[PDB]
Design a protein around this ligand. Structure first.
Ligand SMILES: CCCCCCCC/C=C\CCCCCCCC(=O)OC[C@H](O)CO
Ligand SMILES: CCCCCCCC/C=C\CCCCCCCC(=O)OC[C@H](O)CO
Ligand SMILES: CCCCCCCC/C=C\CCCCCCCC(=O)OC[C@H](O)CO
Ligand SMILES: *C/C=C(C)/C=C/C=C(C)/C=C/C1=C(C)CCCC1(C)C
Ligand SMILES: *C/C=C(C)/C=C/C=C(C)/C=C/C1=C(C)CCCC1(C)C
Ligand SMILES: CCCCCCCC/C=C\CCCCCCCC(=O)O
Ligand SMILES: CCCCCCCC/C=C\CCCCCCCC(=O)O
Ligand SMILES: CCCCCCCCCCCCCCCCCCCC
Ligand SMILES: CCCCCCCCCCCCCCCCCCCC
Ligand SMILES: CCCCCCCCCCCCCCCCCCCC
Ligand SMILES: CCCCCCCCCCCCCCCCCCCC
Ligand SMILES: CCCCCCCCCCCCCCCCCCCC
Ligand SMILES: CCCCCCCCCCCCCCCCCCCC
Ligand SMILES: CCCCCCCCCCCCCCCCCCCC
Ligand SMILES: CCCCCCCCCCCCCCCCCCCC
Ligand SMILES: CCCCCCCCCCCCCCCCCCCC
Ligand SMILES: CCCCCCCCCCCCCCCCCCCC
Ligand SMILES: CCCCCCCCCCCCCCCCCCCC
Ligand SMILES: CCCCCCCCCCCCCCCCCCCC
Ligand SMILES: CCCCCCCCCCCCCCCCCCCC
Ligand SMILES: CCCCCCCCCCCCCCCCCCCC
Ligand SMILES: CCCCCCCCCCCCCCCCCCCC
Ligand SMILES: CCCCCCCCCCCCCCCCCCCC
Ligand SMILES: CCCCCCCCCCCCCCCCCCCC
Ligand SMILES: CCCCCCCCCCCCCCCCCCCC
Lengths: 256, 256
């Protein structure tokens, strides 16, 4: 059972992580150019099975604001969890091997991140981006249901596996777009885009490995709070890695 | 818990009857349908992120008759499996626990084929849009499975159900965006039969959701789990025949 001292230490760790997210949010808000990525519709110009209009831009993602949004969401939920007011509810949740505020945050923050990665790869169709957001949110909600209905060592990973099925779909989409079957242009995917997809695919898999390790509950992973710390570190590293790779690639003032 | 021989034999034959209706429609569509196809496209960057795209390219084509036969055939197959041998014993045992895993395994494939076809009929073609629609629709079904796995009727817990509604509505928001066609240079003339498909199947999809809601509320006649089991079998039969013959009438008749 987690002790009062262990829970209080974790709340301090949440606060520190929140400060790192918040200061990066500020730096991106302040320093980023107005670089935008399109969401498009490619409408039928006739009955189904005939021809299409050219893609039209429906709206544009303000990329700096979107990066600031996923950093800011992490900061907000870390500050909420860190609060003395939430000590009773955190302790109650951690005693049931649950952190629900993590899933509420990730359902929005990780979904913003995967949409931005898709747009950076050139995925623009508004339904592609909407459905990527939804299936990524679904991945998180399956992880939430793993925590709600199972305990470590109980032999039940069904929600986890459903989360893996939902979770892999956006990444199959990215892989299709970088392979670009049927593509005409000899223009190559930029290095920095490969860097984003490869690094963030590794991090996304890392989150899945934490829930797997926690619910397997073997060796040091018998201690649920080890997973709780791992999630805080992985969110910090993943969101910083994506923020600064996008910033370096697209948001610098030489590109304004 | 054990069912009466009369109860479980009655459901066995209900499955067989539904299966025969699906199977005969599958044959009629396979035999009679033309070679009408709908594209899946890639619209690749032909420059750096935030610049220009190639014209959309067709990566592959959905053979619409075959895809309609597929969703009918999946329903037929699962109805025959559920009424057969050792699978029938598992089906009976699961019904006694207020579960039908066979239903969710089938629907995760059959309803996902259906919503992708509806998306393509509306002119959604981007291969990642269609992949992510398939994934988020599958997710909706898997949330319905987790509602049955972890909760009991009347227990007041609908969290997996609500998660299923969040995932489930995403493709339909996509369809609505495409028929409104925001940013279109000219008004988009969507055929009547396409509106028929979207409106009718939206009503049917909401009907499936209402059955699970009514079962887990468990009030009045819905306290009997098997009443919901019968409602699902009827809705699957009516929804799939409605979509099959609307697509057939709209697209599959004339020789190409
Ligand atoms: C060189 C740069 C200097 C940076 C100065 C940062 C100062 C204030 C920012 C907010 C600081 C809040 C950090 C919380 C620290 C914390 O919670 O530590 C737990 C400890 O055990 C008990 O406080
Ligand atoms: C802590 C862990 C976080 C580590 C950050 C991870 C990866 C940075 C990747 C940046 C790599 C940029 C590659 C550039 C390149 O490959 O060049 C291709 C050429 O420029 C065509 O554009
Ligand atoms: C029982 C399901 C009844 C659902 C009937 C829904 C029909 C919708 C319809 O007929 O719409 C097509 C037409 O173009 C008019 O807009
Ligand atoms: C900023 C926070 C991020 C990037 C969080 C990402 C979280 C995931 C990629 C979670 C993945 C999971 C699965 C693939 C299976 C179910 C368990 C999850 C939710 C941990
Ligand atoms: C041929 C089979 C079909 C069309 C089945 C469709 C099923 C659904 C639309 C199910 C929807 C559900 C929700 C929206 C919430 C959770 C419960 C479900 C799975 C019944
Ligand atoms: C509520 C959330 C989203 C609901 C989506 C609805 C799905 C489709 C059904 C109705 C579609 C018919 C709308 C006609 C609009 C035509 C137009 O104004 O151009
Ligand atoms: C069972 C319920 C099925 C109801 C489905 C039928 C809808 C058909 C209406 C669409 C006809 C197209 C209208 C047009 O061509 O303008
Ligand atoms: C041991 C605690 C370290 C606290 C760091 C606080 C954040 C610093 C911001 C720069
Ligand atoms: C770790 C928090 C410090 C703020 C982010 C660093 C700013 C990078 C600017 C380039
Ligand atoms: C749940 C949110 C998904 C719907 C967002 C799509 C809104 C698009 C409408 C914008 C129209 C602007 C015209 C160009
Ligand atoms: C030019 C457009 C500027 C308006 C800002 C729009 C911000 C982007 C938010 C749109 C969200 C809805 C789109 C659905 C896809 C992902 C959820
Ligand atoms: C207990 C920890 C509470 C810290 C909350 C910090 C909020 C910072 C808000 C900044 C707004 C721009
Ligand atoms: C019972 C309500 C709980 C809501 C959970 C919060 C998660 C939000 C998911 C948003 C997904 C948007 C899909 C597009
Ligand atoms: C075992 C049940 C789940 C199977 C489907 C899940 C798909 C995810 C596998 C992708 C592997 C990524 C590489 C690491
Ligand atoms: C021995 C078996 C080990 C299985 C470990 C599973 C955890 C990683 C798989 C994640 C796949 C889905 C990832 C989705 C987001 C990219
Ligand atoms: C289950 C998800 C896998 C989707 C496969 C995508 C098909 C790509 C085909 C490329 C061939 C065109 C050249
Ligand atoms: C750096 C701000 C403090 C947050 C702590 C997280 C440290 C993880 C390091 C990840 C940063 C990678 C930056 C990528 C470089 C882009 C080129
Ligand atoms: C008691 C009613 C039984 C009717 C079964 C119908 C058999 C399938 C015929 C398809 C034509
Ligand atoms: C419903 C049982 C038989 C299936 C055939 C449905 C009618 C097909 C004729 C359309 C042409
Ligand atoms: C603990 C419950 C076990 C889940 C049953 C697994 C589902 C059986 C068959 C599913 C395979 C479908 C593959 C489609 C591609
Ligand atoms: C143990 C895992 C059980 C698998 C679930 C059975 C059916 C799920 C099939 C979902 C397919 C999703 C495809 C995404 C594109
Ligand atoms: C037909 C209209 C489509 C409705 C779309 C539903 C999307 C899910 C919304 C989240 C759940 C909200 C209701 C939760 C109520 C819980 C209180 C007991
Ligand atoms: C209060 C009564 C709530 C009834 C909820 C059942 C219907 C709502 C389902 C919405 C999601 C539909 C997704 C597939 C179209
Ligand atoms: C049983 C329901 C059958 C409905 C058939 C739909 C007819 C569509 C043709 C126009
Ligand atoms: C409810 C399932 C029983 C079979 C339905 C018969 C199919 C209707 C044929 C419609 C003809 C459209 C051309």
């Amino acid at each position: 059972k987690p002790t009062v001292k262990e829970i209080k230490s974790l709340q301090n760790f949440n606060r520190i992580a929140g400060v790192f997210h918040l200061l990066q949010m500020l730096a991106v808000l302040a320093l980023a150019n107005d670089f935008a990525l399109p969401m498009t519709g490619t409408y039928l110009n006739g009955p189904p099975g005939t021809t299409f209009s050219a893609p039209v831009v429906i709206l544009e993602t303000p990329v700096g604001l979107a990066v600031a949004l996923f950093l800011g969401l992490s900061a907000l939920f870390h500050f909420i969890v860190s609060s003395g007011n939430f000590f009773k509810r955190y302790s109650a949740s951690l005693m049931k091997n649950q952190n629900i505020f993590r899933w509420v945050e990730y359902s929005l923050s990780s979904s913003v991140m995967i949409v931005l990665i898709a747009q950076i790869c050139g995925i623009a169709d508004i339904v592609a981006l909407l459905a990527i957001f939804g299936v990524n949110a679904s991945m998180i909600l399956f992880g939430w249901l793993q925590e709600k209905y199972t305990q470590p060592k109980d032999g039940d990973l069904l929600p986890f596996w459903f989360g893996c099925i939902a979770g892999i779909v956006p990444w199959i989409g990215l892989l299709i777009y970088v392979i670009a079957p049927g593509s005409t242009s000899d223009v190559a995917v930029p290095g920095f885009v490969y860097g984003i997809i490869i690094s963030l695919f590794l991090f996304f898999n890392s989150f899945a490995l934490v829930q797997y390790l926690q619910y397997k509950g073997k060796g040091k992973w018998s201690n649920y709070l080890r997973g709780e710390r791992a999630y805080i570190v992985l969110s910090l590293v993943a969101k910083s890695a994506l923020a600064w790779q996008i910033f370096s690639g697209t948001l610098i003032p030489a590109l304004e």
